[PDB]
C-alpha cells in the first residue's frame, strides 16, 4: 500500500543480516557502544577522572584497559558532548569521562533494540517469544548495575567501569563495602547461574549419551536430520538412568526445557534486586545477634566475624587510591593490620 | 571450610594470596559458568518457543508431551529459523546432536579450567601481576585498575588470620 | 442463580507439589537466618 | 544469642502459608474423578 508498508517490506527482507524495524534502534546503538569501548580502551586515559592509565596507548594490556566512569564531581550528569561540561569539545569530553555515559546509554538502548529484535523475529517466523522473555534477565542485570546502582550512590563514579580489571575491582569493592557475598539475593543469583551451568552440562551430556544409533559412523553427528519426526535420543532410557543414579529424573521434555529457561533467568533477576538494595547501601552487611555476642564475649569467633575483618582491611587499604576525590590521608598507624603482615 | 561464610572466607583469602581474578583459568571458569547459564537459558527458551501445539488454551502446554513418545515435541527447524535470523544463519545449530554436544562441552571445559586454576595456584603459580607496570618518563608509577585491585588484595592480606603470622612474609 | 460458564477446575500434580515444597522450604532455610538476624 | 523475636513467627508463616496453599491444591486434584 503506502510508503509505511513499502518501508516495512524492505526492512523485513530475508538477508544475511536481518534488519527489521527494531534494527533502526539496535544497529546504531550497539555499534556505537562497541565502537566507543574499543575507541576508549585503545586511545583514552582515565588520568583526570581517576588518576589511572587505562588505554593501550598508555601501555595497558587487554586485562587492564577500561573506559572509566567520570569523576565523582560530575555527579549523575548525562555528560552529553554538547552539554554544559564539555560544551562541544570532543577532547575535553574524553578527558571528563564522556565515553562512559556514551557507552552506558547507547548500550542500554542497544539492549532495548536487541530484545525488540527478538520479539520482531519471533513474530515474523511464528514462534512464541520466550527468547525475548529470557533476555529480560540480562537487561535487569544491566539496568540495575550500570544505571540504578550509581543513581542511588553519589555519582556515576561508583558505577562499574567498562574493563576487565575494572570489573574485578567492582567485585572487591562490593565485598569490602557491601559484604555482598552475605546477601541472600546474591546467593540466589549464584544458585541460578551455577544451577544453570549444571543444567546446561547435564542436559547436553544426557542427550549425547542416550542417542539412538541412526547411522553407521563412529562419529555420530551425521546421523541427524532437522526435519526428522523422531527423537534423536531415548527419553525413556535417560529417565531410567537418572532415576536410578540420582533418585529423580525428568519425564516431561517440555517441563525440562522450560526449567532450563526458568533457573538462570530467575537467578539473574534475584541478583538484580539485591543490587537495587545496594544502590541505597541497604546491605545484608551484619547479623545483629552475632555482633552483640562478639562485642561482649572476646572469645566468640565465627567465619562471619572473620570476613568482616577482611572487609575492614579492604576498605582502609583501598579507599585512598580508589576514591581520590575524598583526599583520604590515612597515616600508617591507623591502618588495620594483623601481626607482622 | 564446610560452610557458607567459610566458603567466602576461603575465596577472599585466595584472592589476597593468588590474585585469582587475574588468573586466566579462573576467567575461563567464569566464561564456563556465565556461558553455561546463558546457553541453558537460550536452549530452554528456543525449545519452549517452538513447541508444537498439542493442547488447548487452558491446560498446561506440558500436557502436549507424553513420556516416551517417539515424535520430538518441538520444531527445531523453526527454532533455528528464528535464531539464525537473530544472529546470522550460520551462527545457529541446525543439528541437535552438535547443539547438545556444545551444551555439554562449554561448561564442562570451563569448569575443568576452573578446577585446574585452584589446583595450580595450589603450587603458587598465581594470577597475572601488573602492579606498577605503567611508568611515566620520569619513573613515576602511573596506576592502572590492576593497582587498585592490589590495594584491595593488601587489605585482605594484612588482616587475615591476624594473630597467626610472626614473620614478615606469608609463605604458605 | 445461573451457573457461570467461565468456571474452570484447578490442578496441581504431585511433582508440582514436591517442587513447590522444595522451593518454599529452601527459601525458608535461606532467609530464616536474616529473619532471626 | 539475642535474635529477633519475630524471626520465629516470620519463618513459621513463611513456610506454612504457601505450603498449605500447595497441599490444598494437590489434595483437591487427587480427589477429582
Amino acid at each position: 500500500r503506502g510508503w509505511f508498508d513499502i518501508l516495512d517490506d524492505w526492512l523485513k527482507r530475508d538477508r544475511f543480516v536481518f534488519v527489521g524495524w527494531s534494527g533502526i534502534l539496535l544497529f546504531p546503538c550497539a555499534y556505537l557502544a562497541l565502537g566507543g569501548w574499543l575507541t576508549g580502551t585503545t586511545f583514552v586515559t582515565s588520568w583526570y577522572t581517576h588518576g589511572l592509565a587505562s588505554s593501550y596507548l598508555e601501555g595497558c594490556n587487554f586485562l587492564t584497559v577500561a573506559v572509566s566512569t567520570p569523576a565523582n564531581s560530575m555527579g549523575h550528569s548525562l555528560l552529553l558532548l554538547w552539554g554544559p561540561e564539555a560544551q562541544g569539545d570532543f577532547t575535553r569530553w574524553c578527558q571528563l569521562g564522556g565515553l562512559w555515559t556514551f557507552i552506558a546509554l547507547h548500550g542500554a538502548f542497544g539492549l532495548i533494540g536487541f530484545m525488540l529484535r527478538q520479539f520482531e523475529i519471533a513474530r515474523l517466523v511464528g514462534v512464541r517469544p520466550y527468547n525475548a522473555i529470557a533476555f529480560s534477565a540480562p537487561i535487569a542485570v544491566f539496568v540495575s548495575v550500570f544505571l540504578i546502582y550509581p543513581l542511588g550512590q553519589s555519582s556515576w563514579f561508583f558505577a562499574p567501569s567498562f574493563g576487565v580489571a575494572a570489573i574485578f575491582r567492582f567485585l572487591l569493592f562490593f565485598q569490602g563495602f557491601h559484604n555482598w557475598t552475605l546477601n541472600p539475593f546474591h546467593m540466589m543469583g549464584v544458585a541460578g547461574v551455577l544451577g544453570g551451568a549444571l543444567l546446561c552440562a547435564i542436559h547436553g551430556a544426557t542427550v549425547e549419551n542416550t542417542l539412538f544409533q541412526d547411522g553407521e559412523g563412529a562419529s555420530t553427528f551425521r546421523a541427524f536430520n532437522p526435519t526428522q519426526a523422531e527423537e534423536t535420543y531415548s527419553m525413556v532410557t535417560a529417565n531410567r538412568f537418572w532415576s536410578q543414579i540420582f533418585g529423580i529424573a525428568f519425564s516431561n521434555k517440555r517441563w525440562l526445557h522450560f526449567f532450563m529457561l526458568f533457573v538462570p533467568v530467575t537467578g539473574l533477576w534475584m541478583s538484580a534486586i539485591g543490587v537495587v538494595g545496594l544502590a541505597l547501601n541497604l546491605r545484608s552487611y551484619d547479623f545483629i545477634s552475632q555482633e552483640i555476642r562478639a562485642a561482649e564475649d572476646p572469645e566468640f569467633e565465627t567465619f562471619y566475624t572473620k570476613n568482616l575483618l577482611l572487609n575492614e582491611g579492604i576498605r582502609a587499604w583501598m579507599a585512598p587510591q580508589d576514591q581520590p576525590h575524598e583526599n583520604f590521608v590515612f597515616p600508617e598507624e591507623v591502618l588495620p593490620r594483623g601481626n607482622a603482615l | 571450610p564446610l560452610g557458607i561464610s567459610g566458603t567466602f572466607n576461603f575465596m577472599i583469602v585466595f584472592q589476597a594470596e593468588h590474585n585469582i581474578l587475574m588468573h586466566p583459568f579462573h576467567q575461563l571458569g567464569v566464561a564456563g559458568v556465565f556461558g553455561g547459564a546463558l546457553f541453558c537459558a537460550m536452549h530452554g527458551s528456543l525449545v519452549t518457543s517452538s513447541l508444537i501445539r498439542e493442547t488447548t488454551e487452558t491446560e498446561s502446554a506440558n500436557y502436549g508431551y507424553k513420556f516416551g513418545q517417539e515424535e520430538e515435541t518441538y520444531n527445531i527447524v523453526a527454532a533455528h529459523g528464528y535464531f539464525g535470523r537473530l544472529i546470522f544463519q550460520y551462527a545457529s545449530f541446525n543439528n541437535s546432536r552438535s547443539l547438545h554436544f556444545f551444551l555439554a562441552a562449554w561448561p564442562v571445559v570451563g569448569v575443568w579450567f576452573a578446577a585446574l586454576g585452584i589446583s595450580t595456584m595450589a603450587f603458587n603459580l598465581n594470577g597475572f601481576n601488573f602492579n606498577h607496570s605503567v611508568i611515566d618518563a620520569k619513573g613515576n608509577v602511573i596506576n592502572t585498575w590492576a593497582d587498585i585491585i592490589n590495594r584491595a588484595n593488601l587489605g585482605m592480606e594484612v588482616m587475615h588470620e591476624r594473630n597467626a603470622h610472626n614473620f614478615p612474609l606469608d609463605l604458605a | 442463580m445461573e451457573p457461570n460458564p467461565n468456571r474452570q477446575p484447578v490442578e496441581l500434580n504431585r511433582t508440582s507439589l514436591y517442587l513447590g515444597l522444595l522451593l518454599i522450604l529452601v527459601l525458608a532455610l535461606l532467609f530464616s537466618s536474616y529473619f532471626f538476624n | 544469642m539475642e535474635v529477633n523475636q519475630l524471626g520465629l513467627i516470620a519463618t513459621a508463616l513463611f513456610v506454612l502459608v504457601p505450603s498449605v496453599f500447595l497441599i490444598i491444591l494437590y489434595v483437591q486434584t487427587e480427589s477429582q474423578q
Binding site: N239, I248, S251 | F67, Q69 | V26 | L8, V15
Partner: peptide
C-alpha cells in the same frame, strides 16, 4: 529456638527427598 527452627526446616527437606524419590508419581510410557 533458632537452632530448633533451622533443624526443623532441614529435617522437612530430607523427608521431602524421601517422598519425592520413593513416593513419586511413577513415569508411564505412552
Amino acid at each position: 529456638m533458632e537452632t530448633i527452627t533451622y533443624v526443623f526446616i532441614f529435617a522437612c527437606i530430607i523427608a521431602l527427598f524421601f517422598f519425592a524419590i520413593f513416593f513419586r508419581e511413577p513415569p508411564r510410557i505412552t
